[PDB]
Amino acid sequence: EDNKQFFGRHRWVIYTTEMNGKNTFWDVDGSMVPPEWHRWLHCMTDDP
Amino acid sequence: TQLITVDEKLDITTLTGVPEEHIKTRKARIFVPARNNMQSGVNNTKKWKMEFDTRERWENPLMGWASTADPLSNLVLTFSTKEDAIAFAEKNGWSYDVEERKVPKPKSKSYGANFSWNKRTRVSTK
Amino acid sequence: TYKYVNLREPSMDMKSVTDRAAQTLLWTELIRGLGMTLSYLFREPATINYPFEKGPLSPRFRGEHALRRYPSGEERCIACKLCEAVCPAQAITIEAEPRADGSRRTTRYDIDMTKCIYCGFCQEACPVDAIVEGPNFEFSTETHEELLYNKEKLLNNGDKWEAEIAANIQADYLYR
Amino acid sequence: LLKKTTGLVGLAVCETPHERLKILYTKILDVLGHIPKNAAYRKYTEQITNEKLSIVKAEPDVKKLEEQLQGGQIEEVILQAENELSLARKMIQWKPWEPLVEEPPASQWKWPI
Amino acid sequence: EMVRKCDPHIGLLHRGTEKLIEYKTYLQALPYFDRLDYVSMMCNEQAYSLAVEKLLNIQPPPRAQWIRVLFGEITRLLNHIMAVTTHALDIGAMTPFFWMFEEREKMFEFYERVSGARMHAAYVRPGGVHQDLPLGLMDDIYEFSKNFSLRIDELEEMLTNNRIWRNRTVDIGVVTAEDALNYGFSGVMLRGSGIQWDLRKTQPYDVYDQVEFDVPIGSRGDCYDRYLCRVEEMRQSIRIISQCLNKMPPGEIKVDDAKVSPPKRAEMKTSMESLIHHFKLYTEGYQVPPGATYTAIEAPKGEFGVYLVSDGSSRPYRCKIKAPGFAHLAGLDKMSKGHMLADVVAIIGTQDIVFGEVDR
Amino acid sequence: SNLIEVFVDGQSVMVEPGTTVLQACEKVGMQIPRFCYHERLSVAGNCRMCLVEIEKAPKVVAACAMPVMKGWNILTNSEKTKKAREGVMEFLLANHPLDCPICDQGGECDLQDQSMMFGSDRSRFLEGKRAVEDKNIGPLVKTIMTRCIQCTRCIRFASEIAGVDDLGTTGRGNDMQVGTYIEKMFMSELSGNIIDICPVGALTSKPYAFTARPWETRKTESIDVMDAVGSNIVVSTRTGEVMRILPRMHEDINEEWISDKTR
Amino acid sequence: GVRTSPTGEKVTHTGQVYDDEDYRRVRFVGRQKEVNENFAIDLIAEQPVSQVGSRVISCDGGGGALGHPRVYINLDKETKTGTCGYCGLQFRQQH
Amino acid sequence: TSVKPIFSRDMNEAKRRVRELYRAWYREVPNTVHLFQLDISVKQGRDKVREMFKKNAHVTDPRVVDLLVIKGKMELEETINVWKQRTHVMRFFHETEAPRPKDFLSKFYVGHDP
Amino acid sequence: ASATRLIQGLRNWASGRDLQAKLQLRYQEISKRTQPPPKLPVGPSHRLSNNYYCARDGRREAMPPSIVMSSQSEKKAVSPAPPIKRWELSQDEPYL
Amino acid sequence: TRPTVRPRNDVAHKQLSAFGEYVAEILPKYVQQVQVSCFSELEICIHPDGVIPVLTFLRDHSNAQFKSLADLTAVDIPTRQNRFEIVYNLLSLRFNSRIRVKTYTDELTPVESSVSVYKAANWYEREIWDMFGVFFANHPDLRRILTDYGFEGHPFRKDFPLSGYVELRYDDEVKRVVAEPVELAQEFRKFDLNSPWEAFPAYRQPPE
Ligand code: SF4
Ligand code: SF4
Ligand code: SF4
Ligand code: SF4
Ligand code: FES
Ligand SMILES: [K+]
Ligand SMILES: [Zn+2]
C-alpha cells in the first residue's frame, strides 16, 4: 500500500519468482493473483 | 390506363433469392397448432402456422451440440386464415399440405347429472 | 433557455484591432496551447503499472462464469433452464436427468464464451445463485475451443473463485 | 429596425416583410380560387390565409407581427407562405378532394393479425 | 483537390440487429441497444425503455427517472468526448484525445460500479433501471463533476481559439436550416444551423422538464459551430448532473408492477407469486399490448428513434431503429461539395458518425 | 329453435338451454379461467376460479356449473369478477410450494400462467405453508402432493374415463389429501392422462422427469402406431432427440387421451 | 470421487467417459481431460440427517436470500427421510 | 387482376429489357475478367451469364421480369464500378463447393435429403 | 499531489489555471471501497390492503387505437397542437 | 392507478384526433383510416397512389409543417396480400407534433419514391429495397445499402431465415473468401414462449 499515491497506484503486487513450478522471474502474469487477494488488489474492498 | 392485365399465376420464386433445393424439395405444413394438453388455455390455437419438414439434426463432434444444415428449420409463419397461408405458399412455390382446423365439439354439461336417480352418470364421490 | 455559441461581433476600435493583429503576428494563442501541453508535461501521469497494478473494479463486475455450490459441496444448479431461457446470445446449453440419488441436476451445462455477451442475465435469472459471473477477466486463450466451457470447467471456476465470488455476492445481494 | 440575422442559416433577412406577405397571401388566394368551393382544402386554406392576411394588414410593426402570427421569424413566415402557394399549385394538379381512389383489402389495417 | 461526388458505402457493420430482435423477448432484445451507438449505451437503453413503457402503459418510479437522466448526461459527456476527441485526432490534434479519455475512463468506472459492465450495462430497462445505486456512487459523481469543467476548459484552450483548428472547421460543411430539416438531420446537426430544437425541451421525457439547462445554438451551420455546440453541451451536461445529484429522490428503482419488472431476489425466494413472476419474466417475459409506437429521445448524436411494433406476445414483431448517423451520413454527399479531400474527414467528424447505428 | 339469448359483456349470443356460463363465454371467444373444470370430466365446481359477475346480481356465480338464464349479461372483465379471480388465486398460491424451478410443470403450468394473467403480482401470506406427504402410485406418474391444489380432476378421470374408482380425497379441510389412502399402485391402461389433466406439477411424468422443459421443445404432430386406433399425438423433441409424447385433440379418435404404451 | 476407465481416462460425475475405440480421445492427447473431482452426490451424502421435532420443517439452504427458495418438507414418513428438492439436505422427525 | 406496372406494359417490352441487359452483360464480361484478374476465360464467364439468364427463362409475369432486369442492372452496376471484389464475382462459380449427389442412389448413400 | 512547489507553480503558470484545487488524479477524497449494507426502500404496491392488482393494472388499461376516420359547418381549421412557444434567451449566460 | 400506470394525455389525444379529421377531410382521395392510439400517436392510413400528395401536404401546409422525415420503414406482414406496410414518421417543429403515415404494397407493385418531398428518404427507401424488396419507382440511385454485394434475397422478410442461406469462410485453395451453404455447429434453438392464456381482453379479436 501507499495511500499517498493516487487511486489505481495505491495498491500493488510484486509477483513471486516461482508459482506452481514455473519460473516467473520475468514471466509474471496477471492471473498469478489468488482470489482472496484479487478483491483487495482490484479494489473491490478495503479489506485484505 | 396505368394498369396492366397480368393473367398469370402469382409466382415470386425467382425474386426471393431462395436456392432451388429449399424451394422445390421442401414441404410446407399449413395447420392450426394443437393445444398443449399440459394446459387448458386455448390462445395458442387461434392462428394458422406454416412450418416445414424437419431435416437432419446431428451431433457436434466437439461439444455434442445439435448441428444443422437446414436454413428453414426454425421458420414458422403466422396467418390469420388458411387461405392467406395457402396463397403465401403458392406465391413462393412451396409444396404444401393443409390440415383442417380441429375445434372441440360442444359438450352438454350438467352438474345435476352427477347426482342422478337412475342413470350411470352418478359420481361416486365429490 | 438557449444560448448563442459564436455570435460575437468583435470590437473595431484600434485597441482591439491591434490586439487581434498582435495575436496574428505574434502567435499568442499558439503559445497558449504550448503552455497547456507544457502544463501536462509536469503532471504525474495517470498510468497504472499493469500487471503489477490493477484497474479498480466493483463487486458487480461481470467477468468469467462459474457454477456455485452450497456450503456442503452440493452444487446449486437444479437444472431449471431459466438461464438458457433468458440468455440473449443462446450461449447456454443445458441437458439434465435425475442423478443416482434422484436429484434434479444437470448432465450438460455448456456456455459458449464466444457467443456470450457478458450481460449477467443468467446470474439474475438464476433462482438459487448457481450461475454467477465472477471477477475473472484475465482468461484470454490461445485456441477458440478453450472458450467453449462445459460443466467441468464452470465447476472448476466455481471451486477456484468461490472465496471471492461469495464475498462479492455478500457485498451486492441487498441491491438484488 | 433592420434585423441583422434571422439566426437560421441560409434564411436571408427580408427588408420589407409586410409587402412580401401581402403579395404571397393574395397570390395564395388567387391560386386557391381555382379549386371547387366544396373542397375542404380551399375552405381551410382561405380561412387561415385570410386570418394571416388580416394580421399582416393590421400590424405595422414587425416584432409584434412575429408574436401574433405565431410562426417564428418573419422570414420563415414568408417561407411558409411560399410553401403554401407551391402546395396549392400542386393540389390543383392532384385534385385530392375527389372521392377515395380504392378501398383497401378487407383486413389491411387490422392489427394484430 | 475538389470533391465532386462522395458516395459512402455502408453495411460493413450490418449485423441484422433488428431481425435478431424479432426472435428474442423484450428484455432479451434490450442489450442489442447498447451495441448500436456504442458510445451512447444508456441513452439507447433509455430510448428502448421509453418505447416499451409507452406500449405497456406503465411508468418508471421517480428515482429511476432521475437515475436515467443522471446517467444519460454522463453518457452525453462520454459521447461528446468521443466526438470532439476523434474529430481532433483525425484532423491531427492527438493530445486532447489522451487528456479526455482519462475522464472517460472514470465515467466507465461509474458504469461498472452501477452495473458491472464498463460499457454495455443493460442497466436502464423497461420499468426503470435494473438495480439501485451502490452507496458512495453519487459522492464520486460529485467529485468527477466538480473537476470536469477544468478539463473542458483546457480542451477548449487547446482547440477553440487555435487558428489551425479554426482554419480546418470554420468554412467547412455549411448546412442551411432548410436543408437540415429536409435531409432528416437531428440534434447538433440542426442546432449548429441555428434551428432552436432539442427533444429534451420540446418533447420532454423522464424528468428533463424538472432539470434546468440551456441549449446551445449555432449561427453559421459549419463544423466549428457544431464543435462549439458539442462543447457547450458538455458544459450543460455538467449542469444537469449537478441538478440530478442534488434532486435525487428516495424510493424504488423498478416499476412495482411485478408482471413487468422482476421482484427482488429476497422476495422471489420467499413468496409464491414472486417466484411465479420471476419464472415467467425470465423465461417467457412480459407480454406487451398490441400496437406500434415511435418513441424518440434526444441522444447525443441526435434524434434516436424506436419504431417498435408489438403483436400481443412477449417478443417484438418489428423494431425499426431510427438513428441519427444514418440520415447524417446520407447528407454527407451534400455537405462535402466544393470542399477538399481533407475537409471530408472534418465533415465525417462534425456529423458524429458511429457505424453501429448507421448499419444495425 | 328454443335458443335463449344471453349476453357476454353485452354481446348477444344465442345458446342452447342447459349451456353453462363458461360455454356461453366460449361461444364469443372468451376463455374463463379454471382449474377443476375440464370439458370431458364431470363438473366439480370446487376451485372457484371461474367466478364471474352476472350484472344486477350481487353474487358471483361458478361459470363452470351455473346454467345461463335468459337475459343475463355475463361480465367477464368487470371489477368484482377480477377481485374474485385475484382472491381465489391468492388462496390457491397461499399454501403452494415454491417449487417452480424444480418443477416439471414450469413453463407449461396453468397455475403459473393464469396467476400471471389473472392473479395479483405479490403475496400477503406471511405464514408457514403446509407440506403434504408424497404418494407412490406407480412407476409412471411421479407424485409430489404438496403441489396439489385439490382440483379433483384425478378422481373424476379415474372414476369416469379410466373407470378405476381408486383415487379419492382423504382428510378434511386444509388437511384434505388426494391419494389412494393405501400403498396402492394406480396402473390403468390410460393411467398417464392424469399427468395431462393435472393443471399443476403434482402429477408429472416419471420417465420425462427433470429432462426437458416446454419452451425448448419442438412440437411435431404425428400418429400413434402402437395400436390400430390411430391416436393423434404430439412428439415433442429437443435438439434432435425425442423427449416425450403428448396427445393431440381429435374428437373422433382419442378425444384428447392416449394409452400408457403410446405415452 | 472420480473413477477411471480401463483406457486410463477419468470419468466425470455425469458418468461420461469416451470409449476405447472412440476417436474423440485424440483431443486429450498431449493435453488433459479437465474434470472436477468434488462430486456433489458424494459431498451431500456426507451431510448428517438433521433431527428436528416438528412435523413440517422448512429449508432455504442457509443464508436467507443467499440460498434457494424456502420450501416446506413433510416428515410423516418414518421409513424415509425428508429431502430438500433444492439443496439436498435431509431431515428426520425425531419421534 | 388490374395491377400497376413497373416498367413494362406487357411481355414484349419486358423481353426488350431482358435483351438489352444481356447485351450489357455480354459487353462487360471481358472487362470483368481483365480488371478483377479472374482465372476464368471470357467464354466461361459468358456461359455463366447465359446460365443465369436461362435460369429465369420460365417467367411469364411482366412485373417479375421487370424486377429481374432491375436486379440484373444492379449486379451490373456493382460489377462495372468496382464495388464487388474478386470474391463477389467468383461466387457465381461455385468452386469450393463439393459436387452434390444428383441421382436417387447417391443421395440415398450420403443421407436423408430428397 | 506529490509535485514540489516549484513544479506546481510552473504548471499553474503554464496552464493559466490553479491545477491543485481540481486534480484529475483521485486520492483519499473518493468513497470507501467497503460500504455499509443498504436497506433499500420498497415500492408503493408493498401494502397489505387496498392493494388489488386490478386497481393498479397498467397493461390492461391500454386500449386499441380509436379509429377517428375510416373507409369502413364553418368549422375552424386546426393544427396538430398549438404552435411551439418561442424560446427565451438564456438569463444565465446568453453569450450576449 | 397513480404511481405505476402511465398517465393519459387527453389534451394531445383530442388535438391529434381533430387534426386527423382535418387531414382526412382535406385529402379524402387517399386517406383510408385515421386512428389515434391510447398513448396519443396519430396514424394516417393512406392509399399508395397518394404518397406524394399526402406527404407534400403534410410538409407544406401551414397547419401541418411536417418538415422533418424522422424515419421511413417497411413492416412485413405475410398474412396480408399487400404484405409490406410502408411507415412514414414525420416531425413538425412548428407545432411540436408527430404523425405516422402508413401505406401498403406487395412484392411487385412499386411505391412512388418520396425523395422529391424529403431528401432524407433517399437512403431509407433504399434500405427498404435492400431489406424487403419493395421497389421505389423514380428513385435517383436505388440499389443495395446494407447487405453484401452478391447477396440474394431480402433479409427482413419473415420467410427469410435468421441465419441466411450462405455463409462465408476463407478458403486457402482458391486464395479467396468463398460463399458456401450455411451449416450451424449449434442450431438456433427456437423457443415457443407464447402463453396459452389470453393476456389482453381489450384486444380480443371477434370469432368467425
Ligand atoms: S452473461 Fe448473458 S450472454 Fe453470457 S451466458 Fe449469461 S445470460 Fe448468456
Ligand atoms: S438458472 Fe440457475 S439453477 Fe436454473 S438451470 Fe440455470 S444455473 Fe441451473
Ligand atoms: S405446479 Fe406450477 S406454480 Fe406450482 S411449483 Fe410447479 S410450475 Fe410452480
Ligand atoms: S394431483 Fe393434480 S389433478 Fe389431482 S386433485 Fe391434485 S391438482 Fe388436481
Ligand atoms: S372452474 Fe368453476 S370452480 Fe373450478
Ligand atoms: K401435471
Ligand atoms: Zn434446501
Query: What are the angstrom distances between the C-alpha of C74 and each of B96, C20, F100?
Result: 52, 78, 20
Phi and psi for F61 in degrees, rounded to 5?
Answer: -105, 150
Which residue is closest in CA terms to ligand 3's atom 8? F100
Q: Which residues contact I12 (CB under 8 A, 6 or more apart)?
A: C39, I18, I19, I20
The distance from CA J183 to its chain's CA centroid, rounded to whole angstroms, is 31
Partner-chain contact I71 D72, CB within 8 Å: no
Please tell me whether the peptide bond between J161 and the residue prior to it is cis, using omega within 30 degrees of 0.
Answer: no
Phi and psi for I21 in degrees, rounded to 5?
Answer: -70, -25
Partnered with residue J69 across adjacent β-strands are J90
Nearest CA in chain C to B61: C145
Partner residue facing E290 (CB), from D11, D79, D111: D111
| All cell numbers assigned to E201 | 425541451
| All cell numbers assigned to J73 | 420503414
d(CA E127, CA E116): 20
| All cell numbers assigned to F205 | 411424468
Give the torsion sign (CA, I17, I23, I24, I30). Answer: negative
**Percent helix, strand, coil in chain I (nearest 5)?**
15, 5, 80
Instruction: List CB contacts (< 8 A) between C167 and chain A.
Output: 39, 44-45
Contact indicator for J45, J35 with CB cutoff of 8 Å = yes
The distance from CA G24 to its chain's CA centroid, rounded to whole angstroms, is 28
Give the torsion sign (CA, E200, E202, E203, E204). Answer: positive
CB atoms within 10 A of CB J206: 7
- Ligand 2 centroid–CA B42 distance in Å is 30
Q: Tell me if residue D71 falls in helix, strand or coil.
A: coil
Instruction: List CB contacts (< 8 A) between E279 and chain F.
Output: 100-101, 106-107, 112
Q: How far is C101 from chain A (nearest CA, A)?
A: 33
Q: Is the CB of C165 under 6 A from ligand 1?
A: no
- Ligand 5 centroid–CA F61 distance in Å is 10
Q: Identify the experimental approach.
A: cryo-EM
Nearest CA in chain I to C170: I37
Shared-domain flag, residues F221 and F158: no
Helices D40-58/J10-26 angle, 10° precision: 110
C111 Cα nearest atom in ligand 1: 5
- Ligand 4 centroid–CA F93 distance in Å is 14
The strand pair at C92-98 and C65-67 is best described as: unpaired
Shared-domain flag, residues F139 and F236: no
Q: Is the CB of C87 under 6 A from ligand 2?
A: no
Does an H or E element contain C170, and which?
helix C151-172
Contact indicator for J88, J101 with CB cutoff of 8 Å = yes
Which residue is closest in CA terms to ligand 5's atom 1? F34
Partner-chain contact B65 C110, CB within 8 Å: yes
Partner-chain contact H1 B11, CB within 8 Å: no
Nearest to F5 by CA among F26, F22, F24: F24
* Among B3, B4, B9, B18, the residue to mutate for chain H (most H Cβ within 10 A): B4
d(CA E120, CA C4): 35
What are the pocket residues of ligand 3 if the criterion is a CB atom closer than 6 Å to any ligand atom? E 276; F 96, 99-100, 103, 105-106, 109, 111-112, 147, 200-201
Q: What is the 3-state secondary structure (H, E, C) of chain E?
A: CECCCCCCCCCCCCCCHHHHHHHCCHHHHHHHCCCCCCCCHHHHHHHHHHHHHHHHCECCCHHHHHHHHHHHHHHHHHHHHHHHHHHHHHHCCCHHHHHHHHHHHHHHHHHHHHHCCCCCCCCEECCEECCCCCCCHHHHHHHHHHHHHHHHHHHHHHHCCCHHHHHHHCCCCCCCHHHHHHCCCCCHHHHCCCCCCCHHHHCCCCCCCCCCCCEEECCCCCHHHHHHHHHHHHHHHHHHHHHHHHCCCCCCCECCCCCCCCCCHHHHCCCHHHHHHHHHHHCCCCCCCCEEEEEEEEECCEEEEEEEEECCCCCEEEEEEECHHHHHHHHHHHHCCCCEHHHHHHHHHHCCCCHHHHHC
Q: Which residues contact F169 (CB under 8 A, 6 or more apart)?
A: B125, F150, F152, F155, F176, F177, F178
Shared-domain flag, residues F105 and F223: no
Q: Which residues contact E49 (CB under 8 A, 6 or more apart)?
A: E30, E60, E68, E124, E125, E126, E127, E128
Which residue is closest in CA terms to ligand 1's atom 2? C119
Phi and psi for J39 in degrees, rounded to 5?
Answer: -95, 25
What's the reported resolution, in angstroms, to a tenth?
2.8
Partner-chain contact J181 H97, CB within 8 Å: yes
Instruction: List CB contacts (< 8 A) between J22 and chain D.
Output: 44
Q: Tell me if residue D79 falls in helix, strand or coil.
A: helix
d(CA B45, CA B34): 6
Q: Check if B47 contacts D (Cβ < 8 Å).
A: yes
Out of F173, F197, F212, pick the residue that ends a domain: F212
The strand pair at B57-59 and J68-76 is best described as: unpaired
The DSSP call for residue B44 is G
d(CA H69, CA H75): 10
- If one residue of C82, C117, C132, C153 were mutated to test the ligand 1 pocket, choosing by the most ligand atoms within 8 A of its CB, it would be C117
C115 Cα nearest atom in ligand 1: 3
Cell 459512402 maps to which residue?
Answer: E8
Q: What is the 3-state secondary structure (H, E, C) of J5-55?
A: ECCCCHHHHHHHHHHHHHHHHHCCCCEEEEEECCCCCEEEEECHHHHHHHH
Cell 488488489 maps to which residue?
Answer: A41
Which residue is closest in CA terms to ligand 1's atom 6? C122
* Spans of all domains in chain H: 1-114
Q: How far is C99 from chain E (nearest CA, A)?
A: 24
Give the torsion sign (CA, E54, E55, E61, E67). Answer: negative
The neighbours of chain D, by the rule of 3 or more Cβ pairs under 8 Å, are B, E, I, J
CB atoms within 10 A of CB C51: 16
Instruction: List CB contacts (< 8 A) between G74 and chain F.
Output: 131-134, 146
- Give the long-range contacts of residues I33-37, CB within 8 A, separation 24 or more: I33/A43, I33/A44, I33/A45, I33/A46, I33/C56, I34/A45, I34/A46, I34/A47, I35/C171, I35/E134, I35/E135, I35/E136, I36/E135, I37/C174
Q: Which residues contact J83 (CB under 8 A, 6 or more apart)?
A: J76, J77, J106, J107
Phi and psi for B67 in degrees, rounded to 5?
Answer: -85, 155
Out of F176, F191, F212, pick the residue that ends a domain: F212
Does an H or E element contain B78, and which?
strand B77-79
Shared-domain flag, residues F218 and F208: no
Q: Check if B17 contacts H (Cβ < 8 Å).
A: no
Nearest CA in chain J to H2: J109
d(CA C164, CA H8): 72
In Å, the largest CA–CA distance within chain E is 73
Contact indicator for J48, J62 with CB cutoff of 8 Å = no
Cell 462464469 maps to which residue?
Answer: C65
Phi and psi for J65 in degrees, rounded to 5?
Answer: 45, 55
The strand pair at G50-52 and J97-105 is best described as: unpaired
CB neighbour class for F232 (10 Å; exposed up to 12, middle 13-18, buried from 19) = buried
Q: Which residues contact E148 (CB under 8 A, 6 or more apart)?
A: E77, E103, E238
d(CA A17, CA E93): 43
d(CA F153, CA F35): 9
Radius of gyration of chain H from its Cα atoms, rounded to whole angstroms: 18
Contact indicator for C87, C121 with CB cutoff of 8 Å = yes
| All cell numbers assigned to C125 | 435469472
d(CA I14, CA E154): 11
N residues, chain B: 126
d(CA A40, CA C167): 11
Q: Is the CB of C132 under 6 A from ligand 2?
A: no
End-to-end CA distance of chain J: 35
Q: Check if E270 contacts G (Cβ < 8 Å).
A: yes
The neighbours of chain A, by the rule of 3 or more Cβ pairs under 8 Å, are C, I
User: Which residues is chain G interrupted after (C–N above 2.5 Å)?
Assistant: none
Nearest to H21 by CA among H67, H83, H85: H67
CB atoms within 10 A of CB F16: 14
d(CA D50, CA I29): 67
Contact indicator for E86, E98 with CB cutoff of 8 Å = no
Q: Which residues contact E129 (CB under 8 A, 6 or more apart)?
A: E60, E64, E67, E68, E123, E253, E254
Q: Tell me if residue D93 falls in helix, strand or coil.
A: helix
- If one residue of C121, C132, C149, C157 were mutated to test the ligand 1 pocket, choosing by the most ligand atoms within 8 A of its CB, it would be C121
Nearest to G84 by CA among G49, G55, G53: G49
- Ligand 7 centroid–CA G58 distance in Å is 8
Query: What are the angstrom distances between the C-alpha of I76 and each of E210, F204, H75?
Result: 35, 68, 54
| All cell numbers assigned to F46 | 370446487
Nearest to E221 by CA among E175, E257, E265: E175
Q: Is the CB of C63 under 6 A from ligand 1?
A: no
Nearest to D90 by CA among I84, G36, E330, J53: J53
* Among F15, F35, F39, the residue to mutate for chain B (most B Cβ within 10 A): F39
Which residue is closest in CA terms to ligand 2's atom 3? C77
Chains G and H touch (3+ CB pairs under 8 A): no
Instruction: List CB contacts (< 8 A) between C108 and chain B.
Output: 64
Shared-domain flag, residues F77 and F202: yes
Nearest to E157 by CA among F170, C36, B63: C36
- Ligand closest to the CA atom of residue F153: 4
Q: Which residues contact J90 (CB under 8 A, 6 or more apart)?
A: J55, J58, J59, J66, J68, J69, J70, J98, J99, J100, J101
**Pairs of CB atoms within 8 A across C/I:** 58
Cell 404511481 maps to which residue?
Answer: J3
The DSSP call for residue A18 is E
HSE of J206, CA atoms in CB hemisphere, 13 A: 7
* Spans of all domains in chain B: 1-126
Partner-chain contact F113 J201, CB within 8 Å: no
Q: Which residues contact C96 (CB under 8 A, 6 or more apart)?
A: C79, C81, C104, C105, C106, C107, C108, F210, F211, F212
Q: Check if A15 contacts C (Cβ < 8 Å).
A: yes
Which of left, alpha, beta for E250 (phi over 0: left; psi -120 to 50: alpha)?
beta
Alpha helices for chain F (secondary structure H)? 21-26, 79-92, 110-118, 153-156, 193-197
Instruction: List CB contacts (< 8 A) between C148 and chain B.
Output: 62-63
- For F260, the domain range is 213-263
Amino acid at F185: M
Does an H or E element contain H74, and which?
helix H62-80
d(CA E61, CA E257): 11
| All cell numbers assigned to E91 | 484532423
Strands (E), C20-103: 65-67, 92-98
Query: What are the angstrom distances between the C-alpha of E239 and each of E149, E235, E243, E249?
Result: 10, 6, 6, 18
Nearest to J66 by CA among J32, J100, J25: J100
| All cell numbers assigned to E328 | 447524417
Nearest to J200 by CA among E100, I32, E312, F136: E312
Partner-chain contact G67 E269, CB within 8 Å: yes
Give the count of domains, chain F: 2
HSE of D42, CA atoms in CB hemisphere, 13 A: 14
d(CA F15, CA E180): 64
d(CA J76, CA J82): 9
Contact indicator for I56, E257 with CB cutoff of 8 Å = yes
The strand pair at E124-125 and B77-79 is best described as: unpaired
Contact indicator for I46, F122 with CB cutoff of 8 Å = yes
Cell 452501477 maps to which residue?
Answer: E114
Chains G and D touch (3+ CB pairs under 8 A): no
Q: Check if I33 contacts A (Cβ < 8 Å).
A: yes
Instruction: List CB contacts (< 8 A) between G44 and chain C.
Output: 72-74, 101, 103
Please tell me whether the peptide bond between C51 and the residue prior to it is cis, using omega within 30 degrees of 0.
Answer: yes
Nearest to F115 by CA among C81, J199, J192: J199
Contact indicator for C68, C159 with CB cutoff of 8 Å = no
Out of F171, F193, F212, pick the residue that ends a domain: F212
Radius of gyration of chain E from its Cα atoms, rounded to whole angstroms: 21
Does an H or E element contain D43, and which?
helix D40-58
d(CA H1, CA H51): 32
- Ligand closest to the CA atom of residue F35: 5
Q: Tell me if residue C25 falls in helix, strand or coil.
A: helix
Contact indicator for E321, E357 with CB cutoff of 8 Å = yes
